[PDB]
């Protein structure tokens, strides 16, 4: 009947493919030449279960001067995509230390969905050979399964923008998380 508008914000460390993920959702065409540093001011139509939802997609960066304005994008957020890389293990241990407390500081009681990018790159040989120079290995999916549990993520998934695998299901899970009404209030003052 009437589409419901929901706010989705994607946050992740640099070069993780957040912009690529949203772009592939947008036009279903991987940009192989030019990728904007941020993809902003876009609303996409999605239907999951008898409901029509307009999802407003916001991106956050910190490459240059975007960290100062990043806080402005948090308020009135309905769902968060905590995004990281499977080909870059360093993208994992930084999620709890610095990103999570900021997320809870600005926008608490908001559903958070964990996502790892570059599923194919975890099985690549050149990436493994280069990474072994520093005694490192690709991110283990089971480690992600557990890491979702630790940070209380609503759900954790994998995406591959190159082969458009799981993008639709991942963002559908994001939307179903968003439509959820949450649980009242906790320890509400008298």
């Amino acid at each position: 009947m009437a589409a419901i508008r929901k706010k989705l914000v994607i946050v992740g460390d640099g070069a993780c493919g957040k912009t690529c993920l949203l772009i592939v959702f947008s036009k279903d065409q991987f940009p192989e030449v030019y990728v904007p540093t941020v993809f902003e001011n876009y609303v996409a139509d999605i239907e999951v279960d008898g409901k029509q939802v307009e999802l407003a997609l916001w991106d956050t960066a910190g490459q240059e001067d975007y960290d100062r304005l990043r806080p402005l994008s948090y308020p009135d957020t309905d769902v968060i995509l905590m995004c990281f890389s499977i080909d870059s293990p360093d993208s994992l241990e930084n999620i709890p230390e610095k990103w999570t407390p900021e997320v809870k500081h600005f926008c608490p009681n908001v559903p958070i969905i964990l996502v790892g990018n570059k599923k194919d790159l975890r099985n690549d040989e050149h990436t493994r050979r280069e990474l072994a120079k520093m005694k490192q290995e690709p991110v283990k999916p089971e480690e992600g399964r557990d890491m979702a549990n630790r940070i209380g993520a609503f759900g954790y998934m994998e995406c591959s923008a190159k082969t458009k695998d799981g993008v639709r299901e991942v963002f559908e899970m994001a939307t179903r998380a968003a439509l959820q009404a949450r649980r009242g209030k906790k320890k509400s003052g008298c």
Binding site: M1, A2, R5, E40, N41, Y42, V43, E54, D65, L69, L72, P75, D76
Partner: protein, 617 residues
Amino acid sequence: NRPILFDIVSRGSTADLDGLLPFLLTHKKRLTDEEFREPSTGKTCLPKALLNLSNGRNDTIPVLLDIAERTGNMREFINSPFRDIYYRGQTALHIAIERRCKHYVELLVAQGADVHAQARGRFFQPKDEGGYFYFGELPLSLAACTNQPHIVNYLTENPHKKADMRRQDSRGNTVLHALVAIADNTRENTKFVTKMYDLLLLKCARLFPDSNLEAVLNNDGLSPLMMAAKTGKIGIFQHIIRREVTDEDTRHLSRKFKDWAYGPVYSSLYDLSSLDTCGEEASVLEILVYNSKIENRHEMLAVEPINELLRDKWRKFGAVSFYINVVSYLCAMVIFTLTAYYQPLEGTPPYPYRTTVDYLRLAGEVITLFTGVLFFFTNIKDLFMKKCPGVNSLFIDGSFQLLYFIYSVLVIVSAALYLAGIEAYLAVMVFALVLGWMNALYFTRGLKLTGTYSIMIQKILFKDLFRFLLVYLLFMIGYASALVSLLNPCDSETFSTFLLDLFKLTIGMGDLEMLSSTKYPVVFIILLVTYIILTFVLLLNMLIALMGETVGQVSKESKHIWKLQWATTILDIERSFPVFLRKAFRSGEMVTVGKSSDGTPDRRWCFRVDEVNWSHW
């Protein structure tokens, strides 16, 4: 180049813009770059251009739009939202609509401007929250609230994009909700509000025949009718109640029908599908009555169907049960009084019951305790029934709703003592009895002859008498402390005895013997004389001045307040009935006035009234 570009666009000059496109192409700098955007609020070139312009023809907009198109960033640029707090979410389309220029609205919509963008800045929030203007946080709602029928008509039906009228903002308010929110009781505002409301409702019904726009509810659960009733906006409320549509195609959504005319007598059939609800959903009547701080509650109560519905409801069952209520309560109070009188002081409570009189005596205590428990249960059920009304509902008004709670406590509290604290249960039992006897004016509220008396005594007691008693207590404390200090005994017991003597004097009886023992008797008598003069002569009967003025206000508004109190008591009595019985007592008919679009019968509950007119010739 932000300052130079801002100055050029503000001045409206078009020649200066020449050469910007080659510069952007060579430097590959987008028009949305942080440097171009104003740091203060993320403002961009387009909103600055639209804000200031000459006769609505800034003339710089098309050139900037073409430049953005060449850069390939038109979608991002046109609908770039403002950052910060005060003007968060504002876009170019909102500004174009506000400035009452149709041309720029058409241009922005055609070029791809978003039409569902929401403005959520604090400035756009309601008046009481901190925002000076509220319009539903939507473009179409903003146009409707600003009395721009042409803009609304164009925006609703456009070949490029359409703004569905059944669209809800974050608050849940739709276009009708916002239109009611800005509605005012002024003569000019009401006319355009009603006209726009009718136009928009008719358009929505015409485009979508299956769904009725008024059905949609906000997050609070209210509808435009209910919200208007709660906010005290009579101008739109009365029109909504008696809405009649002459059009045959969409006459189903009308709320007032014509039954028949015999000579000067005209009988018309109103609809009350949502005006009265038997617990199925919130009703306009309950919201209008129980809620506090309503600007025009008394005027809104005096409408054609409300009075007749209250009269019929009172006649059908209200009178039958009201007297039953009075009789039962008075009988219970008499039983309680008899139990209290025949209380054996001798012996330690509890007492053994062996004699014939014990049969009768125990029953009184059992009945009183069960009645108190029933009162407590009724008063918790009622509190939860109204979705837990706050302090304002209980303390300020409807004092009797709180008093029976106190009566509920003491009566059971004594019982506990009667089991263990045997010695001093009478002390609180007697006070409970006194309070119960004194709080029977709730039943007198209903009577027309004595309806005002209870309301006005409750009103004057807490407001006038206490305000006067503050000053009286200042005087009392000062004078009593002075007199106690002055006297020479040659101490708590002496002070208490002196206070007792002084109070007995204050009544107007007793004797003035204290002066004999004290030193400086002359000043003591002077101070007593000042005390008596001030209090008795001036204050005691100058309170009567504003007391009589209060009773004068009540006399001037006696008819209006009695109607409210009678409605309150009858609704009160009704709400305690079970749901099935209430449905069995439904009022109205099931007239099938009209058929739906597909021909199915509406079969909606209604209620018919009649009046007389002699000039309809």
